DNA sequence: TTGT
DNA sequence: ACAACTGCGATTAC
């Protein structure tokens, strides 16, 4: 609080979601002891801080909900990259729709789709999309844009959800047993290009069979909701850490209200602000 | 099924999976440095975690490794009875 | 003004309502004594209702709960616990009790001003309204009942659940309709209608039955019961040479119920093959649009109703055509009769009058009704015809491989998508349906991820898709001059239910919208011959 | 930087 | 892209 020193509610340090801030003392100003013979309200009616020891606040953590998706920077960025192992697409053409306004025709194979782009990337939405949506019912556009072209983060997340590993191994060991026939024979060039293709088909092989049984989806590479560490470890004398929270959570808020606004808004601002909210996802993660 | 192009095994676990399998198995002697050995070991929180930290994290983490906590510095991050001298159960 | 002579006991006294037993009097207020506990209000008298679902006993503690005065019950009824007046009265007789609900003046002036009663098996509804359109151009104003909607007179019709609401609800509607507002009540009802009592308990000027066949057979468990009934009821309550007994000679049905009751009345047949019926076509101008023709009948009108079907449509123009000459020898007066039959009512509705190719709205909730709509469109479709239809979740899954195939069978381009979810999977239900013509699911779409969806091997094209929306407006923007496309998912509804959710946005002005719309897709390129759509670039 |  | 001795103590600057 300004110049009250106190938690704000529903804040980075907010008393209610993660604890109280001192032993026994409560934000309405009652104090009680916890264990008591007496009956005592666990926590209180007008303030939702618990009557609890303040160790919680080193150990309870707390979550911020994402209206658009963030993608993990470790298993983008890095130059091994899993989500471009696993999704054949190249890293380039994943890192731009991340981060530079593009499209994806299919993200979906799952489930039925009238339009028949089947395209990787979409450098631009000049196709004909206003035409398509004033003939369909608007809701009805809406309904099936997402198994239309999608765009920044849902294609990632479609594409990684509705897959099938079997068939990726067994089509990266049927190409495994083409390549390789003759490879050997040409320029050291052409050699290079075919040894690092089965490197890539062998590593694919093995991400998608430790997926098969690893009680891990790989859907959890985009990050839907994203945590947010006890206050005590973050106590503010203030820390970046704080300082890259607080301005992840007012880019999200920003989106957040510009999407419930309007769907009349453009396109354009909230896609910019989606690229903020990633970048300070990226900042605050690595 | 049983192994990969460009893993890593054993000598002794190769030699006894030659002898049994049939199926041709082409392995060759890699010397490997001491650095590299450390981050090809069988826990992903002593050696692994020494060098490259986020690198071992975020494979250990995509694949779902179990360590089974048999060394000293494992014990020593989990701030347990190491398994050396009077930690030995005999 | 709800009804009359019902709120006195010296009324249902007069009424032959002798229940044996009764504490005090009908003192309380009631505008009509209603049989059904729904129909009845509080404080109002409720006869018992007689019927295989709901018995006596049943409705007498249904009307105690629903707060009426009195309950009849064969037992002792403790209607008073629950109600404004403690004065009741319990029936033993069900059915007496049943027939004594509705008023005597409210049940006398329907009986009076007038009566016609038209329950066949197919093509009803479609002459209904044609014989109440005669009737109101005559100089008479009456209303007809539907399964739809009950109208026990006038041009409104009121909202009604079930396809044939309680007779004494009804005997009250017509007595008010009758007091102001309308000159006539004619009580029509369904086949499974008079076989309930609803259209029984009604004095029918006119019964005629526009097609006898095997209806109810399942419910009644008898052939012919409800041809039986209805000429019971028309026998009950029949003048000399005032009931008609218009039917195709063809259904044997029909000879049988005609032979039934007083044969004083006069009897006629609308049969167009036949030379006794005297009536034919004797015309060829059949079309999508209208389809005339120059009857040639001594009793019968010159000129005939424009009707969308070619043997079904002509049938009830011809037997409603007896109708409008019964009471008016000159055809002139038909003239209304014709323009109602051809104002593209509800059931199986035309296309639409916008510059476009053919679009029709059909209910073919059934594989027969679907396989008679596509037979019917066949026999007029000069080029390729598309459909598009879906099953009800938690419908019975044995019509849906059928359904699919007889589809697939007659036309040539078909689209699948769900037309009523009903709490289940919209593709669970699309891979049993293709499961009917050989392909799954997994198929469609590893056939949909190869740009070709492989034709059927009878040479046909089947497409798949989940959104009935996009279903439709991909429908009809993919068609041609003479190319035609029928929508079989709800003929006569525009309710859309998917879960817990439901919608109203289906309609046959979403169809219309796409036919105006489909010029820009058309001028920026986007080619609708096949399921994928080939884009610029 | 130095080398990996 | 990654890493390159181990710790301790003092000050001033934020």
Same mark, same amino acid.
């Given at each position: 609080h300004y110049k009250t020193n106190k938690p704000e509610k &529903?804040? *980075?340090?907010?008393?209610?979601?993660?604890?109280?801030?001192?032993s026994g003392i409560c934000a309405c100003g009652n104090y009680r002891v916890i264990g008591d013979e007496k009956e005592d309200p666990k926590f209180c009616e007008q303030c939702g801080?618990?009557?609890? &020891?303040?160790?919680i606040r080193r150990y309870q953590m707390g979550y911020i909900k994402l209206a658009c998706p963030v993608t993990h920077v470790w298993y983008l960025? $890095? +130059?091994?990259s899993y989500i471009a192992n696993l999704l054949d697409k190249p890293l380039k053409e994943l890192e731009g729709l991340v981060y530079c306004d593009f499209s994806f025709?299919?993200?979906? @194979?799952?489930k039925p789709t009238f339009? $028949?782009?089947?395209? *990787?990337?979409?450098?631009?939405?000049?196709?004909?999309?206003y035409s398509i949506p004033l003939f369909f019912t608007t809701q009805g556009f809406d309904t099936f844009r997402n198994r239309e072209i999608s765009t920044g983060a849902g294609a990632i997340r479609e594409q990684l959800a509705d897959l099938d590993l079997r068939i990726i191994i067994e089509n990266s060991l049927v190409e495994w047993e083409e *390549?390789?026939?003759?490879?050997? @024979?040409?320029?050291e060039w052409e050699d290079r290009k075919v040894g690092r293709r089965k490197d890539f088909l062998v590593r694919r092989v093995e991400l998608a069979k430790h997926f098969i049984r690893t009680?891990?989806?790989?859907?959890?590479?985009? +990050?839907?909701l994203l945590p947010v560490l006890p206050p005590e470890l973050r106590?503010?004398?203030?820390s970046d850490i704080n300082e890259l929270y607080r301005r992840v959570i007012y880019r999200n808020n920003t989106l957040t209200d510009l999407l419930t @606004?309007?769907?009349?808004?453009?396109?354009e601002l909230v896609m910019c602000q989606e690229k903020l909210v990633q970048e300070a996802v990226d900042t605050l993660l690595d | 099924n049983v192994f990969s192009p460009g893993e890593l095994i054993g000598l002794l676990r190769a030699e006894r999976m030659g002898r049994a399998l049939e199926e041709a198995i082409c392995y060759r002697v890699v010397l490997l440095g001491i650095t590299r050995a450390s981050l090809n070991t069988q826990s992903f929180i002593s050696?692994?975690?020494?060098?490259e930290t986020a690198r071992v994290l975020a494979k250990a983490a995509l694949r779902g490794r179990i360590d089974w906590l048999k060394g000293l510095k494992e014990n020593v991050v989990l701030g347990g009875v190491i398994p050396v001298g009077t930690g030995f159960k005999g | 003004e709800p009804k009359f002579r019902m709120s006195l006991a010296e009324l249902l006294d007069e009424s032959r309502v002798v229940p044996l037993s009764v504490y005090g009097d009908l003192e309380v207020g009631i505008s009509g004594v209603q049989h059904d506990s729904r129909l009845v209000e509080s404080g109002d008298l409720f006869v018992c209702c007689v019927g295989r679902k709901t018995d006596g006993h049943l409705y007498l503690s249904e009307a105690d709960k629903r707060g009426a005065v009195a309950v009849v019950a064969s037992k002792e009824i403790?209607?008073?616990?629950? *109600?404004?007046?403690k004065a009741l009265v319990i029936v033993e007789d069900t059915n007496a009790v049943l027939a004594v609900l509705a008023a005597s003046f409210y049940r006398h002036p329907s009986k009076s001003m007038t009566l016609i009663g038209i329950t066949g098996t197919n093509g009803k509804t479609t002459t209904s309204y044609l014989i109440k359109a005669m009737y109101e151009a005559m100089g008479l104003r009456t209303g007809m009942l539907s399964t739809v909607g009950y109208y026990i007179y006038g041009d409104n019709k009121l909202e009604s659940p079930h396809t044939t609401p309680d007779a004494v609800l009804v005997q009250k509607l017509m007595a008010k309709m009758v007091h102001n507002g309308t000159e006539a009540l004619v009580m029509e009802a369904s086949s499974h209608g008079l076989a309930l009592g609803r259209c029984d308990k009604v004095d029918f000027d006119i019964a005629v039955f526009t097609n006898l066949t095997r209806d109810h057979l399942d419910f009644?468990?008898?052939? =012919?019961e409800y041809r039986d009934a209805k000429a019971k009821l028309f026998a009950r309550m029949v003048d000399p040479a005032r009931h008609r007994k218009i039917v195709?000679?063809? &259904?044997p049905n029909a000879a049988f119920f005609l032979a039934?009751?007083?044969?004083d009345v006069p009897i006629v047949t609308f049969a167009?093959?036949?030379?006794?019926?005297?009536?034919? #076509?004797?015309?060829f101008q059949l079309s999508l649009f209208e389809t005339q023709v120059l009857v040639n009948t001594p009793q019968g009108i010159l000129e005939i109703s424009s009707g969308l079907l070619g043997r079904h449509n002509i049938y009830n123009i011809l037997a409603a055509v007896a109708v409008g000459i019964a009471v008016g020898?000159? +055809? =002139? &007066?038909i003239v209304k009769g014709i323009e109602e039959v051809d104002?593209?009512?509800? $059931?199986?509705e035309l296309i639409d =009058? =916008?510059?476009?190719f053919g679009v029709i709205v059909d209910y073919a909730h059934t594989p027969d009704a679907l396989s008679r709509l596509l037979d019917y469109v066949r026999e007029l479709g000069p080029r390729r015809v598309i459909t598009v239809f879906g099953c009800a979740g938690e419908?019975?899954?044995?019509?849906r491989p059928i359904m699919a195939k007889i589809a697939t069978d007659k036309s040539d381009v078909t689209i699948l998508t769900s037309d009523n979810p009903k709490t289940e999977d919209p593709l669970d239900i699309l891979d049993d349906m293709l499961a009917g013509v050989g392909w799954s699911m997994q198929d469609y779409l590893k056939h949909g991820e190869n740009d070709y969806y492989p034709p059927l091997p009878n040479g046909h094209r089947l497409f798949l898709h989940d959104i009935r929306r996009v279903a439709v407006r991909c429908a009809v923007a993919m068609?041609?001059?003479?190319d035609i496309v029928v929508v079989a998912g709800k003929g006569h509804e525009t309710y859309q239910i998917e879960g817990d959710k439901k919608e109203?946005?289906?309609? $046959?002005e979403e169809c219309r919208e796409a036919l105006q719309y489909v010029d820009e897709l058309h001028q920026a390129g986007?080619? @609708?011959?096949?399921? #994928?759509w080939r884009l610029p670039e």
């Open positions: &529903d804040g *980075l340090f907010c008393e209610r979601i993660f604890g109280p801030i001192k801080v618990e009557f609890v &020891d303040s160790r960025k $890095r +130059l091994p025709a299919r993200p979906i @194979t799952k339009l $028949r782009l089947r395209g *990787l990337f979409e450098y631009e939405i000049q196709s004909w999309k *390549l390789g026939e003759e490879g050997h @024979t040409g320029n009680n891990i989806e790989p859907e959890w590479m985009v +990050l839907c106590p503010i004398m203030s @606004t309007s769907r009349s808004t453009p396109g | 050696e692994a975690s020494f060098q | 403790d209607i008073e616990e629950t *109600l404004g007046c009644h468990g008898t052939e =012919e195709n000679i063809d &259904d039934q009751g007083n044969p167009m093959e036949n030379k006794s019926a005297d009536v034919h #076509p004797l015309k020898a000159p +055809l =002139e &007066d104002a593209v009512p509800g $059931r199986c =009058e =916008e510059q476009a419908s019975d899954r044995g019509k068609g041609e001059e003479g109203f946005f289906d309609d $046959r986007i080619d @609708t011959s096949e399921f #994928p």
